[PDB]
Amino acid sequence: DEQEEASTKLMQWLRGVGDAPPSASMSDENASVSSANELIFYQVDGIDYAFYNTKEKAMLGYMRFKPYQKRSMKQAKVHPLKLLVQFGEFNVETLAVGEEKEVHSVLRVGDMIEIDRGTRYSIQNAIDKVSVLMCIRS
Amino acid sequence: DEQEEASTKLMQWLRGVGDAPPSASMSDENASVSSANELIFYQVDGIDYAFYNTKEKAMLGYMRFKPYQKRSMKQAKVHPLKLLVQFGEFNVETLAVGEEKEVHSVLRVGDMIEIDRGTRYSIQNAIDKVSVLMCIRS
């Protein structure tokens, strides 16, 4: 249940509900390791982002959405990405290169969507609670 | 609490404790979407793997470890990877190209380690419960 407690503490922090998870080991000093305690949320144009400190920056992180919050349209101009739902529910609208018709998808926890290079995409929190997604860039 | 229930059901399935999460939307039919219900665990050399069905296969998935289970040494020969702890605790041993001294790291939930191209690495479940990690390939 210790590990259930650790998991719950991490999720509550990601959702903005709880305090930062405790430290545990000196492994957070290792070059290749980015611990959860490294994460710090910063707000950009209304959305809270927190990224691990990887060798190539901004390649793995979380987006935290206020209830029903909208992220404006962006384009995967350089890096294809994957969006993986960590908590809650999201509506994602995509328009791939060459197509002229948008696609709307609904994503619940554990669902993933792949955004190809060139695809324009918008994200909206579908529920009246904070939702969290993981952003994985290629 | 509906979304707390969905999150708990997904984690219990990943840990091998519960049944598959329910369906929800027709978005699982969308080309770019890989729903959690797509996941199916298969055992290879003692370890349970489940991968999303992405355009380039085997690029995002989970490894489920029995108590104290060891994954033998592998090498990131082609793809650098990131390992992100989803539940439990792992000891990871790495030997990067050019170095002659191994590095041992301990990872708890939400911690990530980056395995560079050429690095040899071994993984052991550090606890007497099932632990789960996410494997992210570049």
Cβ B86 vs Cβ B110: under 8 Å: no
Whether residues B110 and A84 touch (CB distance < 8 A) is answered with: no
Q: What is the extent of the structural domain holding A72?
A: 1-138
Q: Measured between CB atoms, which of B31, B82, B108 is closest to A24?
A: B108
Q: Does residue B4 come out as left (phi exceeding 0), alpha (psi in the -120 to 50 range) or beta?
A: alpha
How many structural domains compose chain A?
Answer: 1
- Which burial class, exposed, middle or buried, applies to A21 when counting CB atoms under 10 A from its CB (0-12, 13-18, 19+)? buried
d(CA A69, CA B32): 23
Q: Measured between CB atoms, which of B52, B110, B114 is closest to A54?
A: B114
Method: X-ray
The residue length of chain A stands at: 138
Query: What is the sign of the dihedral through the CA atoms of A117, A118, A119 and A121?
Result: positive
Q: Does residue B77 come out as left (phi exceeding 0), alpha (psi in the -120 to 50 range) or beta?
A: alpha
- B-proximal residues of A, 12-71, CB under 8 Å: 21, 24-25, 27-28, 30-36, 39, 52, 54-55, 60
Resolution value in angstroms: 1.8
Cβ-based neighbours of A35, under 8 Å, separated by 6 or more: A23, A24, A27, A28, B108, B110, B111, B112
